[PDB]
Structure 1
Amino acid sequence: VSPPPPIADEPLTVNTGIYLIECYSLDDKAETFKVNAFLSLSWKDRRLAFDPVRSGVRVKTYEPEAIWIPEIRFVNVENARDADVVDISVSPDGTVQYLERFSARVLSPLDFRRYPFDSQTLHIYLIVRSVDTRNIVLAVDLEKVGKNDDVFLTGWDIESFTAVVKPANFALEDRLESKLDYQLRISRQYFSYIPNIILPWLFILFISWTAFWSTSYEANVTLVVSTLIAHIAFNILVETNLPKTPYMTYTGAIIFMIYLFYFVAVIEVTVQHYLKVESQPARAASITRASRIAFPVVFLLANIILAFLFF
């Protein structure tokens, strides 16, 4: 078994297609996702051509070892895919129709800049290395590219599964390589984040701001310092589901900003008490009254600036 020889000196076109059966385990920290799909391959092998009238059979079924099959691999995989050959069909002209069902863990990077209001473009890169006798080029058979309706990815909305029809043909270690880009467009379901993380986080922050309606330093210390512990808990809970990014994220910016607001609240609480002890509560009262308006206003304006910069 060797590659089919060229009629003239044209490269061998292998038509490809991926049909998603299952999409699961999207690990944000690891930037990986598991996929279970059909991989369809089609090429012309004139050595396998037959007469349909004399053979009496329209199609001829073959075992993988019986014929030449192109070595198609995935670029962005952890380990080589687990494949099960479903069917091999040969038409009278020698056109081969290969079909396998595979499962693979795909390495595809994510952009956390807009998290949890982010959309991602997941990639599946198909590749073929050219042999010495002839060069192999990949193609997209749009009729064999898709996903089943039941394909669900927990916490995500699946937009589209398409392929960039033009392959990236490049030289690697003195041989030609034909690469195809299969793109899975997904957008994060941000609903849950509001009553589970966003609203409870704002509530604990508003609790610290009740210290602006109190002169009791011991109670104010308790209010601001204790809610800071809850803020630290929410910060840790959020950052454990996210990887360390070399760029600032929308959530990252907000979290950092809340740390500043807590620090400024501690300063206010310290200043108010110092002036009270220094027998000048009229100065303390004016600062505290200003803080009641300043803190929510500056917080609301800063969040508008952040939302604008990130979206």
Structure 2
Amino acid sequence: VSPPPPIADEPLTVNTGIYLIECYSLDDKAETFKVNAFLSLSWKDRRLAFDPVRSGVRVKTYEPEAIWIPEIRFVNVENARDADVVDISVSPDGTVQYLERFSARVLSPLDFRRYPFDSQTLHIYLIVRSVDTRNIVLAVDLEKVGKNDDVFLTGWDIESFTAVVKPANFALEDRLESKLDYQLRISRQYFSYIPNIILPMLFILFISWTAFWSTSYEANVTLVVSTLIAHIAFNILVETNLPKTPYMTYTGAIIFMIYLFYFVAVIEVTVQHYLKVESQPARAASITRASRIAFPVVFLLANIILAFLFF
């Protein structure tokens, strides 16, 4: 089989469409997601044209091997898609209607800067490489782009599934390549992060601040050091759910900042005891009383500054 010959110099337009059936396994660490969808393809092959009156049929059904089919590939896939051809139908004017159901693991980079209050634009890049006989260009049939109502991505809200209608045409190894961008916009369901990570992390920090209403150095050391250990536990838990980023994430920034609060609390606790031993408790009392206001105030202002910088 060979591609359809150009009636005019015109490049062959392959109309595309992706209909999402299932969305699952968005892996944050791996920056991948699995998809189960319909891929629809449509093009004019004049060699396949027929008269409906003479043939006694209005449609002609072929097997993939019987006719020429464009080699459509995904750019950002781990392995080649697991595809099953559903139907191939030819209209009297030679308009081919191809439909396949596929499943694929898609590589799509994620921006964790606002984690866990982040939104992502997942991409599915459709591509076709031109043949020596003729140039192949991709198009979007908006009527065949969509998603099933039941499509759910665990821990995320699915906003939209649209396609950038104008393809990105470029040269790769002296052949024309036509690339389409299918975009799946999602926003993270941040709810669970509040009672599981944010509030427990705040409680242990506030517990460390009870040392500002205590003169017992031994108890203060126990308060600040023990809660710091609990904070290390949360820092480690958080970084296991996330990949290593060359930037600070919003949660990573808060977690890092809380270490400084534990560090300064230890200094205060040390200074208080040192002055007490040195028989200067009136001075130690001034520092401790100031710390009661300074620590929550600086914590609140530093968080306002961070939320501003990130959102």
Alignment TM-score, normalising by the size of structure 1: 1.00
- How far off is 1:103 after superposition? 0.3
Q: 1:212 and 1:31 mapped to 2: Cα distance?
A: 44
How much identity, in percent, do the aligned residues show? 100
1:124-155 superposed Cα distances (whole Å, 9 cap, x missing partner): 00000000000000000000000000000000
RMSD between superposed Cα atoms in Å: 0.4
C-alpha displacement of 1:216: 0.5
Instruction: State how far apart, in whole Å, the 1-side matches of 2:85 and 2:150 are.
Output: 23
Question: Shift of residue 39 of structure 1?
Answer: 0.2
Aligned to 1:214: 214
C-alpha separation in 2, matches of 1:186 and 1:260: 34
Q: Which runs of 5+ in 1 are unaligned?
A: none
* 1:65-112 C-alpha deviation (Å, 9 max, x unpaired): 000000000000000000000000000000000000000000000000
**How far apart in 2 are the matches of 1:272 and 1:56?**
99
| Structure 1 residue 195, shift from structure 2 partner | 1.1
Alpha-carbon deviations, 1:2-28, whole Å to 9, x = none? Answer: 100000110000000000000000000
Q: C-alpha distance in 2, partners of 1:242/1:285?
A: 43
SS in 2 for 1:121: strand
Q: Which range moves more in the overlay, 243-252 or 297-306? A: 243-252
CA separation in 2, counterparts of 1:148 and 1:238? Answer: 33
Secondary structure (helix, strand or coil) at the match of 1:113 reads: coil
SS at match of 1:112: coil
Report the CA distance between 1:158 and its aligned residue. Answer: 0.1
Matched residue SS, 1:246? coil
Deviation of 1:298 after TM superposition, in Å, equals 0.2
- Deviation track 1:260-300 (CA, whole Å, cap 9, x = no partner) reads 00000000000000000101101111100000110000000
Superimposed CA distance per residue, residues 32-85 of structure 1 (whole angstroms, 9 cap, x where no aligned partner): 000000000000000000001111100000000000000000000000000000
Distance in 2, Cα, partners of 1:137 & 1:168: 9
Confirm whether residue 276 of structure 1 aligns to residue 276 of structure 2: yes
Give the Cα separation in 2 of the matches to 1:194 and 1:100: 42
Deviation at 1:306, TM superposition (A): 0.4
Q: Distance in 1 between matches of 2:97 and 2:26?
A: 31
User: Per the alignment, in what secondary structure is the counterpart of residue 58 of structure 2?
Assistant: coil
Q: Tell me if 1:183 matches 2:183.
A: yes
How far did residue 253 of structure 1 move?
0.8
Deviation at 1:196, TM superposition (A): 1.2
How far apart are residue 247 of structure 1 and its match?
1.2
What are the Cα deviations for residues 211-243 of structure 1, in whole angstroms up to 9, with x where unaligned? Answer: 110011110000000001100000000111111
> Which runs of 4 or more aligned residues in structure 1 lie more than 4 Å from their structure 2 counterparts after TM superposition?
none
SS at match of 1:77: coil
Secondary structure of the 1:229 match is helix
Deviation at 1:249, TM superposition (A): 1.1
> For structure 2, which runs of at least 5 residues remain unmatched after alignment?
none
What is the DSSP-based 3-state SS (H/G/I as helix, E as strand, rest coil) of the residue aligned with 2:113? helix
